[PDB]
Amino acid sequence: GNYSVASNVMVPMRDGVRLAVDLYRPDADGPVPVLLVRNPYDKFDVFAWSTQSTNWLEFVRDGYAVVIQDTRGLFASEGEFVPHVDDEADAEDTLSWILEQAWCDGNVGMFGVAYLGVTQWQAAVSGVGGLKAIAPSMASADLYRAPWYGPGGALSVEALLGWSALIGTGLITSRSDARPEDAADFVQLAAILNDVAGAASVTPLAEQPLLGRLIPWVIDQVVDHPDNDESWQSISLFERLGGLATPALITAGWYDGFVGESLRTFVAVKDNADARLVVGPWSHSNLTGRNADRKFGIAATYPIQEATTMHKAFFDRHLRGETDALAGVPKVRLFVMGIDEWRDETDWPLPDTAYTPFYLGGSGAANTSTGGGTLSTSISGTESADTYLYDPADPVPSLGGTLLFHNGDNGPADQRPIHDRDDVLCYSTEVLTDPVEVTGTVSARLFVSSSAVDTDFTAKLVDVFPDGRAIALCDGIVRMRYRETLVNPTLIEAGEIYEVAIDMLATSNVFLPGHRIMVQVSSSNFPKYDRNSNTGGVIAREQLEEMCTAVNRIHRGPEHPSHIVLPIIKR
Numbered sequence: 001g002n003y004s005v006a007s008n009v010m011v012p013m014r015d016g017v018r019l020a021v022d023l024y025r026p027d028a029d030g031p032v033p034v035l036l037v038r039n040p041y042d043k044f045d046v047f048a049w050s051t052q053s054t055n056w057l058e059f060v061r062d063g064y065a066v067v068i069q070d071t072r073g074l075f076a077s078e079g080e081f082v083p084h085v086d087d088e089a090d091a092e093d094t095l096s097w098i099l100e101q102a103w104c105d106g107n108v109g110m111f112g113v114a115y116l117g118v119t120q121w122q123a124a125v126s127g128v129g130g131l132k133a134i135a136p137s138m139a140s141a142d143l144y145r146a147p148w149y150g151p152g153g154a155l156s157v158e159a160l161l162g163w164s165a166l167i168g169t170g171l172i173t174s175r176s177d178a179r180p181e182d183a184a185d186f187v188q189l190a191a192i193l194n195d196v197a198g199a200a201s202v203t204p205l206a207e208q209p210l211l212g213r214l215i216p217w218v219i220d221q222v223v224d225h226p227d228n229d230e231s232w233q234s235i236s237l238f239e240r241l242g243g244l245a246t247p248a249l250i251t252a253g254w255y256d257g258f259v260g261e262s263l264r265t266f267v268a269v270k271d272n273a274d275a276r277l278v279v280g281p282w283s284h285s286n287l288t289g290r291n292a293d294r295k296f297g298i299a300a301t302y303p304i305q306e307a308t309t310m311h312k313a314f315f316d317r318h319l320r321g322e323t324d325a326l327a328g329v330p331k332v333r334l335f336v337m338g339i340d341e342w343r344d345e346t347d348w349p350l351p352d353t354a355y356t357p358f359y360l361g362g363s364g365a366a367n368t369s370t371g372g373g374t375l376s377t378s379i380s381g382t383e384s385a386d387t388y389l390y391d392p393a394d395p396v397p398s399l400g401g402t403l404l405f406h407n408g409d410n411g412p413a414d415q416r417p418i419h420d421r422d423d424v425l426c427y428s429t430e431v432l433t434d435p436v437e438v439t440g441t442v443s444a445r446l447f448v449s450s451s452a453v454d455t456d457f458t459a460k461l462v463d464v465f466p467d468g469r470a471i472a473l474c475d476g477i478v479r480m481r482y483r484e485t486l487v488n489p490t491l492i493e494a495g496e497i498y499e500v501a502i503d504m505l506a507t508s509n510v511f512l513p514g515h516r517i518m519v520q521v522s523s524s525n526f527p528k529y530d531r532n533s534n535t536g537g538v539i540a541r542e543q544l545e546e547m548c549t550a551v552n553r554i555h556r557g558p559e560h561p562s563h564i565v566l567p568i569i570k571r
Contacts, residue, residue, distance in 0.1 A: 001026055001027065001028070001060075001061045001062065001063060002026070002027040002061075003024055003025055003026045003027055003060045003061065004024075004025055004027060005022060005023065005024050005025075006022065006023040006025070007022050007044075008020045008021075008022070008076050009021050009022070009023055011069070011093075011094055011097045012093075012097075013072070013079075013089070013090055013093045013094075014089065014093050017072060017077075017078045017079040018077070018078050019069055019070060019071070019072055019077040019078070019079070019090060019094065020043065020069065020070045020075070020076030020077045021043065021067050021068065021069040021070070021094075022043050022044070022067070022068045022069075023065065023066075023067055024057075024060045024065065024066040024067075024068075025060075025065045025103055026060055026061070026062075026063050026064065026065060028063060030105070031102065031103055031104055031105035031106070032063055032064060032065050032103060032104070032105055033063070033064050033065070033105055033107040033108070033109070033315065033319040033320055034064065034065040034066070034067060034098055034103075034104050034105075034107070034108045034109070035056070035059060035064055035065070035066045035067070035108070035109045035110060035111060035315065036066075036067045036068075036069070036094065036095065036098065036108060036109070036110045036123075037066070037067070037068045037069065037110065037111060037112045037116055038069050038071055038087065038090070038091060038094070038110075038112070038116065038119035038120075038123070039068055039069065039070065039071065039112070039115075039116055040070075040071040040074050040081070040115055040167070040170075041115075041170065042070065042074070042075045042170070042174070043068040043069055043070045043075070043076070044075070044076075046068070049112070049113060049116060051287075051302075051304065052113050052137070052138075052287055052302065053111065053112060053113050053116075053137060053304070053307070054111065054304060054307050054308040054311050055304060055305060055308045056111070056308070056311075058308050058312065059308075059311070059312060059315070062312065064315065064319075065103055065104070067094075067098060069094060071086075071087065071090065071119070072086045072087075072090055074170070074171075074174075075174055081171070082217055083167075083217055083221075084118070084122070084143060084235045085234075085235060087118075087119050087122040087123075088122045088123075088125065088126065088235075088237075091119060091122050091123035091126060092123070092126035092128060094123075095108055095123060095126065095128045095130060095131055096128065098130075099128070099130040104130075106130055107130065107132050107318075107319040107320070108128075108130045108131050108132065108319070109131070109132055109133045109134065109135070109315050109318065109319050110123060110131070110133075110134045110135065110136075111134070111135040111137070111249075111311060112135075112136070112137065113137040113138050113139070113251075114137070114138050114139060114258065114284070116137075116139075117136035117137050117138060117139025117140075117258075118136070118139050118140055118141075118143070120134040120135070120136045120139070121134070121136060121139065121140075121141040121237045121241070121265065122235075122237060124237070124241075124244055124246050124248075125237050125240045125241075125244070131246065132246075132247070132318045132319050133246065133247040133248070133249070133314065133315060133318040133319060134246060134247075134248050134249075135248065135249035135250075135251070135311055135314065135315075136248065136250055136251075136262070136265065137250070137251035137252075138251060138252060138253055138256045138257075138258050138259075138262060138282075138284060139250075139258055139261070139262055139265070140258045140261030140262065140265070141236070141237040141238040141241055141261060141264070141265045141268070142232075142236045142237070142238040142261055142264075143232065143235055143236060144228045144232040144236065144486070145228075145238075145260065145261050145264075146257060146258045146259075146260055146261035146262075147159045147163075147257045147258055147404060148160060148222050149226070149228070149486075150260075150476075150477065150503075150529070151260065151476065151486075151503035152456075152476055152477040152478045152479055152482065152502065152503060152529070153226070153228075153478070153479035153481070153482030153486050153489070154456060154477050154479045154529035154530060154532070155205075155222075155223070155226065155529065155530040155539075155540070156257070156404075156528065156529060157200040157205065157526075157527050157529065157530040158196045158197065158200055158398070158403060158404065158405055158406035158527035158528060159257055159404040159405060160218065160222055160223070161192060161196055161199050161200055161208075161211065161218075161405070162192075162193065162196050162404060162405025162406065163404070163405065164211045164214075164215055164218045165189045165192040165193050165199075165211065165405075166193070166405075167214075167215055168185070168189050168210075168211060168214040168215060169186060169189045169190075171214060171215070172185055172186055172189075172214075173186070185210065185214065188210050189210070189214075192210075192211075193405070196405050196406035196527060197397075197398075197406055197526065197527045200406075200526070200527040200530065201527075203542065203543050203544040203547075204540060204541050204542060204543060205223065205530060205539070205540040205541075206219055206223050206224070206540040206541050208223075223540050224540075226538070226539065226540065227482075227486065227487060227488075227489060228486035228487050229487065238261075238264070238265070238268065241265060241268040241269055242268055242269075242272075243272075244269060244272065244273070245272045245273045246269070246273055247273045247274040247275065247276075247314070247317075247318045248265065248266070248269050248273065248274075248275050248276070249275075249276045249278075249310070249311060249314045250262055250263075250265055250266045250275065250276065250277050250278070251277075251278045251279070251280075251307070252277070252278070252279045252280075253279065253280050253281065253282030253283060253284070253287070253411075254279060254280070254281050254282070254335075254337070254411065254473075254474070254506070254507055254508065255281065255282060255283035255286075255400065255401065255402055255411020255412065256282060256283055256284050256402060256411075257283075257284055257402045257403070257404040257408075258284075259279075259402060259505055259506065260503070260505040260506065262279075263277075263279075263348065263441070263505075263506055266348055267348065267349075270331075270347075270348075274317070274318070274326075275331070276310075276314065276329070276331060276332070276333075277331070277332045277333065277334075277348050278307070278310070278332075278333045278334075279333070279334045279335065279508065280300065280302060280303075280335045281296050281300055281335050281337055281411070281412070282302060282411070283400075283402070283403070283408050283409060283410070283411035284404050284408055285404070285405075285408050285409045286408070286409035286410070286411070287301070287302035288301055288302075289301045289302075291400075291409075291410050291411065291412050291413070292410050292413070292414075293410075293412070293413065293414040293469055293471070294412035294413075294414075294469070294471055296335070296337065296340050297340050299340075299341070299342065300335055300340065310329060313325045313326050313329060314326065314329075330344035330345065330346075331345070331346055331347060332344065332345035332346065332347060332348045332350075333345070334348075334439065334508050335508070336437070336439065336508045336509070336510060337412075337463075337473075337507070337508060337509040337510070338435075338437075338463065338509045338510030338511060338512050338515075339435075339510045339512070348440075349440045349441065349567065350439055350440060350567070350569055352569070352570075353439070353440045353567045353568070353569060354567070354568040354569075354570065355440075355565050355566075355567055355568075356377060356565065356566050356567075356568045357377070357445075357561070357563040357564075357565055358375045358376065358377060358429070358517065358519075358563055358564050358565075358566055359375065359376055359377070359378065359379050359380050359556070359561055359562065359563040360373065360374075360375065360380065360427045360446075360519070360521075360554065360556040360562045360563060360564075361373075361374045361375075361376060361380030361382070361384075361427070361556055361557075362374040362380075362384075362427065363382075365386055365387075366386040366425045366426060366427055366521075366554075367386060367388060367422050367423075367424075367425055368419060368420060368421065368422065368424065368426065369416075369419035369420075369424075369426045369470070370419075371386075371425070371426055373386070373425060373426045373427035373428065374427055374428065374429070374430075375427045375428055375429045375517060375518070375519060375564070376429065379558060379561050380556050380557050380558065380561070381557070381558060382557055383555075383556075383557030383558060383559055383560070384555075384556055384557055385553050385554060385555045385556065386425050386521075386553065386554045386556070387551060387552070387553045387554075388422055388423040388425065388522075388523075388551075388552060388553075389422070389423060389549055389550070389551055389552075390423055390455060390456075390522070390523035390524060390532075390534065390549065390550045390551075390552050391423075391549040392524075392531045392532070392533055392534065392544065392547045392548075392549070393544060393547075393549075395524035395525070395526035395531045396418055396421060396423060396424055396458070396522045396523075396524045396525055396526065397417075397418060397526065398525050398526060398527055398528035398529075399413040399414075399415055399417065399418060399472065400412055400413025400415075400472040401413070401460070401472050401474075401475050401525070401528055402475075402505070402528070403528055406527050406528075411472070412471045412472060412473075413471070413472050414469045414470060414471060415460075415462055415470040415471070415472055415520065416468065416469070416470055419470065421522075423522050423523065423524070424520055424521075424522050425520065425521040425522065425554060426518060426519075426520055426521075427518065427519050427521070428464060428516045428517065428518040428519075429516050429517045429518070430516070431514060431515070431516055432511055432512070432513050432514065432515055432516065432517070433513055434513060435510050435511065435512050435513060436510070436511045436517065436568065437508075437509070437510045437511075437568065437569040437570070437571070438461075438473075438507060438508075438509055438510075438511065438517075438566045438567055438568060438569070439507070439508040439509070439567055439569045440506060440508075440567025440569070441505070441506045441567060442461055442474050442476075442504040442505065442506055442507060442564070442565065442566060442567065443476070443501055443502060443503055443504055443564070443565050444459040444476070444501070444502040444504060444519070444562075444563065444564040444565065445499060445500070445501055445502075445561075445562065445563055445564075445565065446459070446499070446500055446502065446521070446554060446555075446562045447497050447498070447499050447554070447555040447556070447560035447561075447562050448497065448498055448500060448552065448553065448554055448555065448562075449494075449495055449496060449497045449498070449552070449553045449555065450480070450492065450494060450495075450534075450550050450551070450552045450553070451494050451495070451550050451551040451552070452494060452534035452535070452536070452548060452550040453491040453492060453493070453494060453535070453536040454479070454480050454481045454491055454492060454532060454533075454534060454535065454536040455480055455523055455532050455534045455550045455552055456477055456478065456479050456480065456523050456524060456529070456531075456532040457477070457478050457480070457500060457502060457521065457522075457523055457552070457554075458475065458476070458477045458478075458502070458520075458521065458522045458523060458524065458525045458529075459475060459476055459477075459502045459504055459519055459520070459521055459564065460472060460473075460474070460475035460504075460519065460520040460521075460525075461473040461474050461475065461504060461507065461517075461518075461519055461564065461566075462517075462518040462519065462520060463509055463511055463515055463516075463517070463518075464515055464516040464517075464518050465514075465515060466514040466515065470518065473507045473509055474504045474505045474506060474507040475504055475505070475520075475525065475528075476502040476503045476504035476505060477502065477525060477529050478500050478501065478502045478503075479532060480492050480498070480500070480532075481536065483498060483500045483501075491536045497555055497560065499560075504564075517566075519564050521554055523550070523552050531547075533546075533547040533548065534547060534548040534549065534550040535547060535548050
């Protein structure tokens with residue numbers, strides 16, 4: 001079909017501030033269903049994000065109108081920009097405006113990735129009857145849990161500094177008349193992006209002259225609020241998701257920074273409305289399926305046309321009343337790593353998931369990959385413990401995983417470069433003779449003790465290949481002061497043994513014959529997470545010099561059954 005495009009149509013918000021939108025309307029008679037996208041990266045720049053989403057022009061050619069809007073305070077829109085705080089109201093007023101237009105038939109939907117996904121959850125809680133469906137990709141409904149902090153209570157510092165530098169560069173390269181400093185700033189912002197770990201290594205972390213100037217929010221909201229307090233609660237949508245009845249087509253990536261939260265949104269809305277889930281082996285910046293030491297095959301490449309077809313079927317069902325539009329479409333579609341194949345599922349978590357404990361054990365010290373650390377479904381008979389020194393000045397480098405900006409294009413990273421570290425404990429199963437599928441949420445329960453009043457403990461699931469590659473799958477961290485709650489932290493007593501849980505997000509991997517299941521335990525993973533100072537103080541306000549090293553210990557045996565819980569699937 002044919003269509004037209006109207007640029008910079010100004011939409012008034014409740015406070016009088018006008019946001020700019022571009023209207024892609026089909027050349028048809030009568031009102032049509034409409035799809036909305038709220039974008040902070042310039043509505044004009046469609047190529048920048050569309051390749052990670054859908055060939056949505058197909059929607060317009062098929063009769064849908066598409067509205068792309070500049071969020072408040074950015075590019076063509078008026079007002080002041082502050083992340084997240086105005087999106088709920090602005091989305092509500094925008095949806096109301098769309099519903100009032102002559103070309104809207106009363107059915108509105110949304111789609112988009114990341115920030116363009118978070119804004120959909122913020123729109124969904126408005127209660128606007130006209131919003132019939134959303135499709136949040138690689139998104140979150142709880143900004144503290146993803147992407148700024150996490151279930152463990154540690155700051156995702158590389159995510160914060162990287163995104164902030166990107167926003168800053170955008171704020172500058174768009175100004176209404178360049179400034180004298182602009183040139184210099186753009187240089188500094190680039191220096192941050194080329195070495196995020198370096199930018200995150202400065203102490204006190206809270207001191208950000210550049211970023212703090214270009215976007216105060218970086219410190220005023222994120223850095224200054226390490227507890228999941230009221231400031232975070234205010235923009236979290238998660239608790240309100242259970243009361244909604246809005247269909248949601250959710251997409252996630254196993255190595256994507258928002259994966260944990262993306263999956264949780266599916267679980268939160270699947271009972272009250274038509275929810276769909278698609279999870280590929282992608283990281284935020286790498287949807288190719290190709291990584292430095294791991295290739296998932298061409299079938300793993302983000303299937304943009306298939307995604308477009310699925311989104312159209314989803315919108316046809318919920319916005320155009322086509323009751324059989326989703327016939328044959330699975331509820332859940334996962335890329336199962338190892339066998340490296342897409343597979344349909346009827347639900348997530350998968351039905352028949354056997355949450356199986358794999359206990360830490362072994363003779364001697366489990367320090368380093370050449371230690372004697374073992375993993376077994378049987379409880380260890382010997383009461384032992386592995387000890388190591390965690391020094392904030394020398395944290396374990398982040399390698400792959402869900403990194404967003406700091407080397408965030410190699411999720412399934414080979415871990416061998418850090419296997420020689422004494423602060424990296426390794427526990428592996430024997431070489432497998434039969435495949436073992438692990439698909440679902442993953443967590444660990446460790447009995448630990450520290451010489452400090454606070455510290456961190458990390459756990460990483462790894463697939464060890466016959467050729468030696470130790471490929472990262474999923475990982476988590478627990479900042480001890482938040483061991484029981486992210487809201488009201490309390491310190492620990494040196495030497496006392498605590499049983500703590502580490503949320504390791506999720507994965508889908510078949511450990512094939514010849515492989516080993518391995519878990520890496522430590523007390524740091526920088527800059528994925530900022531370093532714990534081991535002092536019990538305000539971490540972001542401490543000087544490296546005033547920080548302490550900590551002698552940490554992992555207890556294992558009959559009385560302290562430390563283990564990782566794997567979601568075993570047997571078919």
